[PDB]
Design a binder for this molecule. Structure first.
Ligand SMILES: CCNC(=O)Nc1cccc2c1[nH]c1ncnc(NN3C(=O)CCC3(C)C)c12
Length: 168
């Protein structure tokens, strides 16, 4: 029921909290939780592994059936699947993996998917093993997303770096 609490407002429509997205989803009951997916929807580590584990692997089973129909997602693309016990829906979004030579401009396309949903609980995209600059990723989010986004950033050092970038 979108019961967000304890977020710091960064812009008109972007909020941030130093929190685990899994625990946030369980307490907030969001309409949409965003997954930092790969193109095969193989949820083996990071946010993706944690979300899948919290669904007792139901997310992975569903993801495999979607991929059977779709083939791989495109970088910058997404799909809407069930949110299982975490949310009404999970929006699986593929940001570019710059560590693997993919183009950082597809981070714009990745965040543009958020505009198809009124309110989202989301992680930072193209971070972790994807290797993009995290301050840049937050800037792309702020400049691209116009619906309401609640960013959960679990790593304290990264959270602090991000919030510093909005200091007046
Ligand atoms: C109940 C058990 N919960 C868990 O294992 N959760 C869990 C595991 C691993 C990773 C995350 C996580 N939860 C998160 N929430 C938000 N961002 C996350 N990852 N990131 C950061 O922290 C900075 C940027 C990015 C790399 C995306 C994670």
């Amino acid at each position: 029921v979108n019961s967000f609490s304890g977020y710091l407002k960064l812009t008109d429509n972007v909020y941030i909290k130093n929190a685990d997205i899994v625990e946030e989803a369980k307490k907030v009951k969001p309409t949409v939780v965003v997954n930092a997916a790969n193109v095969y929807l193989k949820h083996g580590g990071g946010v993706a592994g944690a979300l899948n584990k919290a669904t007792n692997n139901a997310m992975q089973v569903e993801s495999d059936d979607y991929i059977a129909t779709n083939g791989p997602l495109k970088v910058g693309g997404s799909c809407v699947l069930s949110g299982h016990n975490l949310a009404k829906h999970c929006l699986h979004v593929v940001g570019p993996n710059v560590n693997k030579g993919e183009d950082i401009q597809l981070l714009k396309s990745a965040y543009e998917n958020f505009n198809q949903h009124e309110v989202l609980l989301a992680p930072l995209l193209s971070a972790g093993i994807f290797g993009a600059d995290p301050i840049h990723s937050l800037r792309v989010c702020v400049d691209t997303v116009r619906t309401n986004v609640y960013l959960a950033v679990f790593d304290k050092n990264l959270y602090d770096k991000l919030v510093s970038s909005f200091l007046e």
